[PDB]
Amino acid sequence: AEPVYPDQLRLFSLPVNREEAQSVKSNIVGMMGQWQISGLANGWVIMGPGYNGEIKPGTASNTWCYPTNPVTGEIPTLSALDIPDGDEVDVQWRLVHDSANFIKPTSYLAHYLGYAWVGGNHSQYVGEDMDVTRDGDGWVIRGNNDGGCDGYRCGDKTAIKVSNFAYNLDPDSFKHGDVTQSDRQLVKTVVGWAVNDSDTPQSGYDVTLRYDTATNWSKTNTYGLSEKVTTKNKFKWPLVGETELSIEIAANQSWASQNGGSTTTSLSQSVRPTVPARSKIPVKIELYKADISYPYEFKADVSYDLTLSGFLRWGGNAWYTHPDNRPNWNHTFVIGPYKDKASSIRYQWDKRYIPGEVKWWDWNWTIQQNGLSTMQNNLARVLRPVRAGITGDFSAESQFAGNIEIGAPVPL
Amino acid sequence: DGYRCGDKTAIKVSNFAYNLDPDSFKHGDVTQSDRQLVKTVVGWAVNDSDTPQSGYDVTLRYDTATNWSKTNTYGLSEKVTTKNKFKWPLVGETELSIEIAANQSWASQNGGSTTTSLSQSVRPTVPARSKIPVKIELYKADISYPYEFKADVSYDLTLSGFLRWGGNAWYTHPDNRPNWNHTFVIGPYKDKASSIRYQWDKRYIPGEVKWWDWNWTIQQNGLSTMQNNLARVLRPVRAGITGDFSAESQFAGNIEIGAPVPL
């Protein structure tokens, strides 16, 4: 009838229903020794491993219970972190070099999920002695490995990677400056006149210039068969003498398949002047290709992709199949608005009461190992909002530029 | 007197561009020459109703286009044939031959096109119980006109020579005296490789040092030395510009609405 959160279940040896027990059966049965038997509400019994989790009518010396006035355990929302203004790279630098608000929370998440060796060689603690570096368009955070170490595969440290930054602009904050042009090349121009020899103003005039460009491709596969039968004989014919006669019959079959596609870009310009009675107006339209550049600024919310890369500990990890052969793992979370299920921490946390939805990380396992409030506080920090002012520059090559003009009237 | 003293460094200046002040641009008379006719249309708009009518349209349009393509084709073929001799009724000895064959073929194509189009329309308002004549003409012509404006001047600066053995600012610090060519854009930002301000401002991040090492130049010459030199190199430039526009085989047209004639 109501969702059951496994972290709230409490076994005593001095009451859960049959329907409730079935919806989270594998959590209850997992928390049981082989051949053990425990009671449920209303005359029912839940049996442990070795009885394959069977739920049957009966009695028991001990009972599975769920508290009156339980809690949901949602992840709390913290206030935003303000980063001093700069361009995109300066703001990214300030975020990844923050120890208390970024480096440690991220390191603990990797640790709690089961990644091995999340730290450097000059400290015994998680998240300490970490090196930060710039790599291509992203950043890499890893424990320092210049000295020696002691442990199985202690030289194989876990990396934290940060990339794909995005901005949610405040609607009233965006501004831009001068737009400049360079390497201008002419495509085409038109000039002309609109003449009105009537006694009223007229607006029924139109001059339009249009330029289009396109590309295309295709691929074809053809297969076929052929069969032929021929006979040859020799005969004596009148006047001509001995003649060789040959007759040939043949047939063929063929099959073919094709796929393809195309892309088109188009730009057009028009002028439509209103002309006074007994007068004329000149018009002009021009089109150029040009390199375009301009400065800009805005205020926004900063989001990014977080990737964890390393090997998973033998003694236990949170991957739902719980592998024990120390495999190398790579997983990406999106810190920000929802995009998908595999990459959403909030989606997976909130659905921990439905066993059929547990396809990636097991968050019930992390709660049992570390405590509910431990996990809530860590995740609230990992998912904390970030805000900053941004300044920057736009540039692009071979874009379009144009000019449309209506001139002064000349009396007829 | 010196090692390779005859191999001197060159400074090259090109690709000038202008940022016009918005209220400064003017142009003069537009003239035409070598005019060739494409097409004309004439006609009448007739209104025999008791109200003015504006529901009339005459439109003339001219289009031109080019295209290209390339194709690559490959294939295979296999054949088996047998031949035997038999004696058949009435016909006698006959040679009989039977042939079976199969084939396969693969092909790939790429291509593209460009189109230019120009059109003109006239839509007159006609008084009640009256008629109006109209005319449209299209020509190809050479176009020319004078102009003037005030602007900010920007350009591309290219340095070309060999790099000194005793030390240079290229981030890999080569020591084999190689010949070098690098271009900076003096003006608004276009890219990172060509922007002095971008590279200077990011000198605190080692992963961004991909071209010139500006920390090296500071250590060698002093911070204020380098600031004053770069401030002069990047100083803004302004001038008034006069000039002339010309282009061949452009379009020219004329659209006319005439005086009404009572019915």
Numbering used by the authors:
A (entry chain A): 1 to 14, 25 to 422
B (entry chain B): 160 to 422
Manuscript excerpt for this entry:
Aerolysin is a β-pore-forming toxin produced by most Aeromonas bacteria, which has attracted large attention in the field of nanopore sensing due to its narrow and charged pore lumen. Pore-forming toxins (PFTs) are important virulence factors of many pathogenic bacteria, which are secreted in a soluble form and upon host membrane binding, they oligomerize into transmembrane pores undergoing a complex structural reorganization. Domains 3 and 4 form the 120 Å long 14-stranded β-barrel, with each protomer contributing two antiparallel β-strands. Four distinct constriction rings, two at each end of the pore, were identified from the structures and confirmed by MD simulation.
We obtained near-atomic resolution (2.2 Å) cryo-EM maps of WT aerolysin solubilized in either amphipols or SMALP, as well as in LMNG-CHS (2.6 Å). The cryoEM map in SMALPs shows an additional density, not observed with amphipol, which allows to partially model some of the lipids surrounding the β-barrel. Additional density is observed in the transmembrane part of the β-barrel in the SMALP data set which cannot be observed in the amphipol data set. Interestingly, just below the YW belt, two polar residues, E237 on one β-strand and Q263 on the opposite strand, interact with each other and are fully embedded at the core of the membrane hydrophobic environment. Carefully looking at the fitted model, such conformation could only be consistent with the formation of a double H-bond produced by a protonated E237, which is consistent with the expected higher pKa of glutamates within the hydrophobic environment of the membrane. In amphipol, K242 interacts with S256, while E254 interacts with K244; in the SMALP structure, K242 forms a salt-bridge with E254. The overall Cα root-mean-square deviation (RMSD) between the structures in amphipol and SMALP is 0.82 Å for the overall structures and 0.74 Å for the extended β-barrels region (i.e., residues 215–285).
